[PDB]
C-alpha cells in the first residue's frame, strides 16, 4: 500500500478519492487537508450532484472521517507548512487546492514530510509536467519530486496531437475548448479577477484564457510555439470538447486522419485515448475514464487544414489521468 494525502478536497480531490477507491489496489488515502469542517466535508463526499451517492458508509468526528470502516485523518490548515504528512507515513500528496500551483509553495508538503507532490493543474517552477500516455516514460523517480499532471484540456489535446504530429506533422494549430463551467466561475454576476468569469455561468457562453495548448509544449517539446487556444465555458456541469484546427504539409483525408487515431488507440495508450464513431453528445462522455475521446464524425479536412474534436470529462477523465500518473509515481522509488 502506498499512502496518499489530498490537499484540497474539492471537485478534483473528491473525484480522486472516489477513483482511488474504485480503480486502485495499491494506493490508500489516509489523510486529507481542506478548509471545510468535517460535517460539510463528509456530506460532500457522501452526496455528489454529478457522481451520485458514495457506495460506502461515511462517518465523521472532530479529527477524522471514516469511510468503509477506514479512519482518515482530516486537517484544516490554510498553510501546508503547518501539516505533518510524516505523522501518517504519507508518501504522495495530491495538491488540488488550486492555490499552490507554484511548486515553490507546493514544495512545503515535502518539508512537512511528503516524498512526492502531484499538482492537479498546470504549475510553475515544477520539476516536470506530465500527460499520462504521452510523456510519462520521461518521469525521473529520483529528481521529479514536485510535478504537474497538467490541465484537463492538455490531457485531451496532447494524446491526439501526438498521434497526428507523429503521423503527418503539425505545422501550426489553434484550439477552442468548449468546456463545462467550473467552480471558480460565479453563479450570479459578481466579483472576479477575470471579468468574463464574473458572469453568471449557467446562462452564459463565457470565453476565458486556457493556457493548455501552450502547456502542450511542456509535454510535446516538438510542438513548442506552434499551438495556441482559448476556452468557451458553457452551461453543462461537466463534460468538455477540444476542437483543434491545424495545418500539415502531409496529404491527408478525413479517412486517413481518422485511421491514424484508430490505429494508435489500442493497448495501454488506448486507456488514455479512445476512438469513437458513435453519435456522441456531452452526457455520453460523463464519467468516461479516458483523457481524450476522439470523435471521428467531427473530423474535417480543407486542403492542408484539418479540424479534429476530442471529448473529455474534465472532472473524471482528468482524474483518471491524474491517478495513472499517481500509480506511476508509487510504483517507483520514494
Amino acid at each position: 500500500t502506498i499512502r496518499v494525502g489530498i490537499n484540497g478536497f474539492g471537485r478534483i480531490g473528491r473525484n480522486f478519492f472516489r477513483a482511488v477507491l474504485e480503480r486502485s489496489d495499491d494506493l490508500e488515502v489516509v489523510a486529507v487537508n481542506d478548509s471545510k469542517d468535517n460535517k460539510t466535508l463528509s456530506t460532500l463526499l457522501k452526496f455528489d450532484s454529478i457522481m451520485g451517492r458514495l457506495g460506502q458508509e461515511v462517518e465523521y468526528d472532530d479529527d477524522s472521517i471514516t469511510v468503509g470502516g477506514k479512519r482518515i485523518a482530516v486537517y484544516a490548515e490554510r498553510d501546508p507548512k503547518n501539516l505533518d504528512w510524516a505523522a501518517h507515513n504519507v508518501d504522495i500528496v495530491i495538491e488540488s487546492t488550486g492555490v499552490f500551483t507554484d511548486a515553490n509553495a507546493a514544495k512545503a508538503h515535502i518539508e512537512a514530510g511528503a516524498k512526492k507532490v502531484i499538482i492537479s493543474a498546470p504549475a510553475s517552477n515544477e520539476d516536470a509536467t506530465f500527460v499520462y500516455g504521452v510523456n510519462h516514460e520521461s518521469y525521473d523517480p529520483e529528481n521529479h519530486n514536485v510535478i504537474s499532471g497538467a490541465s484537463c484540456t492538455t490531457n485531451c489535446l496532447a494524446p491526439m496531437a501526438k498521434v497526428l504530429n507523429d503521423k503527418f506533422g503539425i505545422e501550426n494549430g489553434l484550439m477552442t475548448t468548449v468546456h463545462a463551467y467550473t467552480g471558480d466561475q460565479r453563479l450570479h454576476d459578481a466579483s472576479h479577477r477575470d471579468l468574463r468569469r464574473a458572469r453568471a455561468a449557467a446562462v452564459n457562453i463565457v470565453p476565458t484564457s486556457t493556457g493548455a495548448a501552450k502547456a502542450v509544449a511542456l509535454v510535446l517539446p516538438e510542438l513548442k510555439g506552434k499551438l495556441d487556444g482559448y476556452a468557451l465555458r458553457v452551461p453543462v456541469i461537466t463534460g468538455s470538447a477540444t476542437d483543434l484546427t491545424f495545418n500539415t504539409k502531409s496529404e491527408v483525408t478525413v479517412e486517413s486522419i481518422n485511421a491514424a487515431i484508430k490505429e494508435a488507440a489500442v493497448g495501454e495508450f488506448g486507456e488514455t485515448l479512445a476512438y469513437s464513431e458513435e453519435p456522441l453528445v456531452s452526457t455520453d462522455i460523463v464519467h468516461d475514464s479516458h483523457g481524450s475521446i476522439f470523435d471521428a464524425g467531427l473530423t474535417k479536412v480543407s486542403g492542408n487544414t484539418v479540424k479534429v474534436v476530442s471529448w473529455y470529462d474534465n472532472e473524471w477523465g482528468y482524474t483518471c489521468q491524474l491517478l495513472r500518473l499517481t500509480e506511476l509515481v508509487a510504483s517507483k522509488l520514494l
Copy 2:
C-alpha cells in the same frame, strides 16, 4: 432632489441603481461603496446577464464612475465607519451588502453622516420593518432611521396575506416559495454553512429555510405565530413564486378567494399587488415592478383549506418595493 448612497453594489444594489434611473425623478445615486475595483464595478454595471446593457455611457477613473455624464464617487471600504456620506450630501443609504443586516452595525452609516439607512433584507435590532403597501403608513420620520424593507418573499406573501386575512381570517398557513437561485448558493458542490445550499445550484432543486413567513408578523402582527414556510431554490436565474396553503373558518370558493384579491388590487396598492388571469410562467414576471403578482388560475379550495400562489421577481420586484419605500422616506423629514 434627495441624494442616495449604496453600500454593496451586488445584484440588489445594481438593480436599485437602475430602478432609480428608470422610475424616479427625485432621487439620484451620487456615491457607491463596494468591494470591487472601479474597472470591475463599472463593467458589472454596464453589462448584466439578467437586465441587459445599461442604456447610458459608463466611464471610470481612479476614484469614480461616470454614468450618463454624472460623476459618482466610489469607495472600497469593508468597514462602513471608514465612509463619509455627509461629504457628498447623501441623505439615504441603501444597505445591500448582506453583511450588515444587524442595524447596530448598519448604524455606522448614520455616524458617517447619512440621515437614513434602508437595509435591503430582514434585519435585527432595526427601528422598523416595512413591506410597502402593507404597513408603510406606520413609518415615523423622526424615529425610524435604520429600517428594513424585508425580504423578497415577505414582500410577495404579505400583500396577499393581508387581503385574505382581512376578508376571511387566516387560522394557520404554511408556505413554499419556489425561488430562483441566488448568490449565496454554490455553482458546484462546495463549502457552505447550509449543507443543501452547498449543492450545485443550477442542476438541483435545493430546499432551504427562509423565515419569510414568520417575518410577515413584523408587518402584520395579527398573523404572529400563524405562518411558517421554506424555500425550494430551482434552476432559474430570477423569478419566484410563493405558494401559500392556509386554513380559514370562513366558507370560501376559488371564486371568492380570487374576487377578494381582484377587489383589493387597485389604486396605489395595485402597484404592489397585481391580480392576473394570464397563463404566466416565471419569465413573464422577470422585470415586473410589483412585489406580488397573484395568479388566479392557481387558486385551489378543499373544504376550509386554501392554496393561493403569487409570483415575484425577487430581484426587480423586490427592488421596486424598496424604491417605493425609499421614495416615502425621501418625501418626509430628513434631520440628524
Copy 3:
C-alpha cells in the same frame, strides 16, 4: 420467465427496459413497438442523457435490435390493432406511448394476443388503478386485465398520505409538486394546447395541472374529495418533490409526524416509501428505486396545519413501482 412487450419506447419505456434488465429475474422484454426506426431506437437505448450508457452490446437490423445477445422484435405501428403480441408469446404489455390511456384503446393489445396491459399513467375506463405498496393487495388476476400504474406524482403522494391518514386523519390537503420538466413541454415557446406548457421549459417555472392528488382517491377511496393540487415544472431533467399541506383534527408535532412515517417505512412497504433525515437535493434522489422518499427535515406544523414533503425520481422511481406492479401481475394467473 414471463414475456413482456413495450408499446412506446420513450422515457418510461426505456427506463422500464433498463429496470427489467437490472431488477427482474423472471421477466424478459421480447418485443417493442414504437414510432422510431431501428437505428434511432437502438441509439437511444444504448445512450441516455440521464442514465448513461447501457452496459450491454446493442446491435440492430431491419426488424430487430439485439441486446446482450438477445434478439428483440421491433415494430412501428401507429395503431396497435395492427400488432401481434401472440406471435412473440407476449403475456404482458406495458402501454407507455402516452396516447392510449383510455382502456378502450389500450385493450387492442389484448385483442392482439396479450393477456394483460399495464398503462404507465392515469387511465380512463380501466379495470383497476394501483399504487404498489398502497393498494396492490386488491389486484384481481381474473378481472384486472387492463390496469393503470397511476402517475409518478400519485406514486409519491399516496404512500405518505396513507400513512398519515391512517395515523392522524386527513381532513383536507392541497399539494404542489415541484417537478422535472417532461417531454410534453416545448424547448422553445411554441404550439401547445396548454399555453403554459407551450413555454420554453428549460428557462421557466411552468404551472400545469396534475390530476394526481384527486387520483389518490382511486387508490385510497377514504380520501375522495379530500385532496387536490397542481404542478410547477422547473428546469431539472429528472427528479421531483411532492409538497402536501393538510389539516388534521389530531394534535400533532413535527416529531410525531416524522415518527409515523419512520415507523411505517420498514418492510416490503419500505421499498416503496423511504424515510430520510439526510440533506437531500434533487440530484441525490435521481435513480432512487423508491416511489416516495420522505424528507423529515422539511416537515412543518402550524396549529392543525401540516406540511410534508417527499422526493421521487419521476422516471426511475415511478418505473420501479411499475415494475413491482408488473412482477405481481406476472406472479399470478395469466388466463
Copy 4:
C-alpha cells in the same frame, strides 16, 4: 407605408414582428399565417420567454388579433396557395415557417398576390441570396422577387470574412459555431433524424452540421470552396458565436487582424458588423441588432493561421439583418 405579411409566426416570425415595431417607421405587418388559433397566437405574441412582454396591448377575436389598436388578419392555412395576400394589399411576405425554403414552393406567395417573398433561411431555386451589408447592393428590384436572407451563421460569418478576405486574403478556413439550442432539438432524448439533435438539448453539448460556411459562397463568390464548418449546440436559449480558423498568405498580427475589422465596422456597414473590445459573454449580445459582433479579445495568430470569433443573437441579430433586407426591398420597385 409598405405592408408586410408573415408566413410562419414562430421564433423568427415573432422576433420580426417586434423588430418592425421597434425599428421601422415605414413597414407595417397587417396579416399573419401560422398554425394556431388566435388565443394561442396572441398569447405567444404577448409573452416571450426571451424577449419579455410585448409593450403594446393585444386583443383577439375569431378572425384577427389587434396590437396597439392595429387590426392584423390571422390565417392558419397549411398550404400558402390558399392565402390571399392581395386582399390585405401586402407587398412583401416573410417566409419563416421553415418548410418552404424551396423557392418553387415559396413563390406561391406571389401567386397569392404578394410582390416579394423573403425566405428567412438558406433557400433552393431562389432568385438571389443576401447578407445585408455584404452583397445587398446587387439587389435587382425587377428580377429578384423570391429571395433568401441566408442563415443566422452566414450573417455573422460573411461580414467578418469579407473584411479579412478583402484585406489579407483568405486561402481556406474551418469554422465552429457555438450556438444556442433551437426549436428543432429535443427537450428529452427522443426521435430525431439527427441522432445527436435527438439528445436532451438543455443538458448536452450537441454537435450538428451546418452548411453556413459553404453558403458564404452565394454571398461572396471569391470564397467559393474555401470554407467549411459545423456547430456545437449548447444550453443557452439564444446567443451564439462563430469561431473561424483560416490561413492567409499575408503577414498578420493579432493587432493587424483586429485593426482591419475596426476600420471597416463604421457607418452603415457597422450596423451589420460591430467591433468590440468589451468583456462580452453571450447574454451581452442578446437583443443586439448586429449581424456580427467581432470580439477583438479572442483573436489569435499562429504564423499564417488566424482565429477570429464573432458573436450573434441568432434570433434578434439575424432578424435585424432580415429587416434591413426587407427595408431595401420596400425602398425600391414593387412592380
